[PDB]
Amino acid sequence: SSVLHDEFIAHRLGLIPLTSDDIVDKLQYSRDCTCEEFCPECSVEFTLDVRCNED
Amino acid sequence: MIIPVRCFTCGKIVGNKWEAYLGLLQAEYTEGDALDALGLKRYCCRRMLLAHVDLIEKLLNYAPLEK
Amino acid sequence: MNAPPAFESFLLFEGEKKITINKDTKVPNACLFTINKEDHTLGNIIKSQLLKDPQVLFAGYKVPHPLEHKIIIRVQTTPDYSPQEAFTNAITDLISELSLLEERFRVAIKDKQEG
Amino acid sequence: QTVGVIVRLERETFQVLNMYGKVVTVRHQAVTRKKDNRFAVALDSEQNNIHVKDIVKVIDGPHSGREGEIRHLFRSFAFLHCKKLVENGGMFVCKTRHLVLANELIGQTVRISQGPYKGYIGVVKDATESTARVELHSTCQTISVDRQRLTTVGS
Amino acid sequence: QPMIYICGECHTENEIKSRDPIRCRECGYRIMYKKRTKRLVVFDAR
Ligand SMILES: [Zn+2]
Ligand SMILES: [Zn+2]
Ligand SMILES: [Zn+2]
Numbered sequence: 001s002s003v004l005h006d007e008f009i010a011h012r013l014g015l016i017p018l019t020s021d022d023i024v025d026k027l028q029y030s031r032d033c034t035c036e037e038f039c040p041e042c043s044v045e046f047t048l049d050v051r052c053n054e055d
Numbered sequence: 056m057i058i059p060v061r062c063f064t065c066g067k068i069v070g071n072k073w074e075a076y077l078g079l080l081q082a083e084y085t086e087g088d089a090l091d092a093l094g095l096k097r098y099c100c101r102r103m104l105l106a107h108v109d110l111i112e113k114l115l116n117y118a119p120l121e122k
Numbered sequence: 123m124n125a126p127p128a129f130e131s132f133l134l135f136e137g138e139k140k141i142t143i144n145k146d147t148k149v150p151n152a153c154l155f156t157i158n159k160e161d162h163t164l165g166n167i168i169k170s171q172l173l174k175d176p177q178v179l180f181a182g183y184k185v186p187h188p189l190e191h192k193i194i195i196r197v198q199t200t201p202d203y204s205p206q207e208a209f210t211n212a213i214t215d216l217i218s219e220l221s222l223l224e225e226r227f228r229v230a231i232k233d234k235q236e237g
Numbered sequence: 238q239t240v241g242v243i244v245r246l247e248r249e250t251f252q253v254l255n256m257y258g259k260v261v262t263v264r265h266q267a268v269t270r271k272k273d274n275r276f277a278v279a280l281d282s283e284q285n286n287i288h289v290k291d292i293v294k295v296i297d298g299p300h301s302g303r304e305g306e307i308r309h310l311f312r313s314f315a316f317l318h319c320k321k322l323v324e325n326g327g328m329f330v331c332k333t334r335h336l337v338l339a340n341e342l343i344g345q346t347v348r349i350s351q352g353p354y355k356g357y358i359g360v361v362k363d364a365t366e367s368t369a370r371v372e373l374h375s376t377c378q379t380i381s382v383d384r385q386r387l388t389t390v391g392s
Numbered sequence: 393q394p395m396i397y398i399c400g401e402c403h404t405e406n407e408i409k410s411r412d413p414i415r416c417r418e419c420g421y422r423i424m425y426k427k428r429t430k431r432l433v434v435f436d437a438r
Binding site for chain 4: 123125127129133
């Protein structure tokens, strides 16, 4: 419900740097993984849930 | 509308600098001093902060559709 | 609408070969190496290493078109030598140099971190 | 059971040529129109596929050494056309055999589960038995994907 | 079947039936907006 449309938010999220220092060598490329959608061997899950209830 | 996450030119993160920059300006820093204090050395990153227009506040002035 | 997917520049398409070898028939002992899904990075380092070889008479590379992802490397050697041999030896030399550089960078980082 | 082609037009009566090849007279009201088989299948002596609007020779049957153009087709009968034949207004009928040569995934929401587009999600706009067209939610492009790389997302 | 619309003024959800005129049951406003879809929306973050 923000003033920014979905692709705007998604693009900004894509640009957030994430610490990768030791995990990245372990992870497989998602295109190479045998999982069907996303598994801990090829991805990291994030969630965000924020609502403004104040003035 | 909102501060870009990265400098377009070099990719340095600037999206965590806008509120700090506004703070330094109200503390009487000059823009050049404030940009120095935030570590923005290359003139591309400095352009990012110097030229930003925070239009999202104006947009936040309108009531949302859903309560 | 006509944008190619970004992965197209480094992922081989089904059936596409990484590297193809042809003879250059204008002159003797000359080969053209076509490499798919590579760009100036590999082409330039390989060419420069080949130019270090005293038995290589000609070495050069080009990207035929910036919107395509192919490089062509042309190698001519002396008759007592082969362009295939020169290409293989150039890659081996580059790998050796990179391995040494990685070892020495590790050592330098450790020195700097200790003091 | 009997289907025919009207070969002659008159003020009151009709002379409609039926499949059997004989001529029977009927009126305007009694005869009711039937749609034409724009596509169909049949069989022939040579064991080759025959469609409408093909030149064929009647090497056997009621007629002999006769050439005509098919206009309507029946399971075991076919209607031939011509311009050189006085009898029956140039139209006669001969047997087909005697004649010789002379979607369920569309609109569903799918996740690409394999390949370089793994993870993308889209709506299937067209699917054959092997390949599908997927409008991608994120890229403004419709791509063709092998159906073995798709999984339908369920609600 | 429900077909929930949001009122443009009072922001109140309220049911609407096809062939029923558009009017907020609370404030009588005549402009309403449809709610976001429940279909899966997925973006590459590019
Ligand atoms: Zn996986
Ligand atoms: Zn910069
Ligand atoms: Zn209202």
